Amino acid sequence: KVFGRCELAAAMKRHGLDNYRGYSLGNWVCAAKFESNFNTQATNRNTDGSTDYGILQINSRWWCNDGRTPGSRNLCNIPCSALLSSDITASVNCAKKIVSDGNGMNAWVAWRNRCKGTDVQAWIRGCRL
Ligand SMILES: [Cl-]
Ligand SMILES: [Cl-]
Ligand code: NA
Q1: 114 Cα to the center of ligand 1, angstroms
Q2: Which residue among 16, 39, 58, 108 is least packed, with the fewest CB closer than 10 Å?
Q3: Which residues form the C-type lysozyme domain?
Q4: Is the domain covering 1-129 a CATH 1.10.530.10 domain?
Q5: DSSP character for 42?
């Protein structure tokens, strides 16, 4: 599924991401825009043989099991394919674990390089929340 901007903002707010660990909603919407262009089915093969999955491009090296990243962890205890669903629950629940692990949203390279330090509230302007 390819989300609209305000559609995704409302879904993320319902799932408790607004101000989660101090990150306002616009941060999460900005991260999803540049990680996946709002597409739940996005996948990208990393260098090291791991793969990033879903709307927030969660990495199989640490966070999910895809059966083809030897020596990796599965800290969210999920198959990586669950992160491609039109229902974003699994992605949100795993993202909450990632952002809590000490490095905040710097875990997402596109957030660090394209959202951090910008007016991220622009990403939820005009939406019904
Ligand atoms: Cl915001
Ligand atoms: Cl933080
Ligand atoms: Na894994």
Answers
A1: 15
A2: 16
A3: 1-129
A4: yes
A5: -
